[PDB]
Swiss-Prot record, chain B:
Zn(2+) binds at H35, E83, H92, E103. It is found in: Cytoplasm. It comes from Rhizobium leguminosarum bv. viciae. Fe cation binds at H89, D91, E110, H127. This is Ferric uptake regulation protein. Residues 1-86 are annotated as: DNA-binding. Acts as a global negative controlling element, employing Fe(2+) as a cofactor to bind the operator of the repressed genes. Residues 87-137 are annotated as: Dimerization.
Length: 133, 137
């Protein structure tokens, strides 16, 4: 549960007023943003930030393994934070929003299933996709 | 029971001109244990039909990709691995020691997932569950 700027500072990255704005925009993003969204939001905060600065800062965060790049066939990219703690997710498809949840009850069933098949469960990923009732 | 549709049959259905060499490559792709790269597809295909060239394997793979039968995963260094697109969906248990995918279904887990969805005000329309296992100690 550390901020993006903290992670950056810890991993040997030079920080500044503009790079911290970018980090916050990127931390606060509802979506998985591209560089165009990151720039548009950052210039609302600091009108002096250039598109070159946004791009440069994003690349450095990627270098540090704080964010992961997802490339599309056409060469455009979207970014996600690389999580320290991994949770099950319930996706609100209508709003494109993620809801964190935990279910020790399901986890115990998963352990039983794994065991019946010859395995000790060491990790899991569960995503649920929902529409309003 | 229905006759399962093979990768080469799907390729044909999607307008791809199949040749014996392309069928060999289709079968190698469908039967691959891992998510293969072009190198592995070539090494395995040439053991079936010694006349198959690397150029042919590459060309054929791109055509399967064009047909939406396989999807490509690119790495930072430009290398790629491929996976078939599933009509089989399921939940999966991964044997980490071997890379084996074990399919399973759990009505009990499904009931709890629906309940979690419901309690957050949602109807569940889909789910993805991956379990990661090591051999029992």
């Amino acid at each position: 549960a550390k901020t993006l700027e903290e992670l950056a500072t810890e991993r040997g990255m030079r920080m500044t007023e503009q790079r911290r704005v970018i980090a916050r925009i990127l931390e606060d993003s509802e979506d998985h943003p591209d560089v165009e969204e990151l720039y548009r939001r950052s210039v609302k905060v600091d009108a002096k930030i250039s598109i070159s600065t946004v791009y440069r800062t994003v690349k450095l965060f990627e270098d540090a393994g704080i964010i992961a790049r997802h490339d599309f066939r056409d060469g455009r990219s979207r970014y996600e934070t690389v999580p320290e703690e991994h949770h099950d997710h319930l996706i609100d498809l209508k709003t494109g929003t993620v809801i964190e949840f935990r279910s020790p009850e399901i986890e115990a069933l998963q352990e039983r299933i794994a065991r019946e098949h010859g395995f000790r469960l060491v990790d899991h990923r569960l995503e649920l996709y929902g529409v309003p009732l």
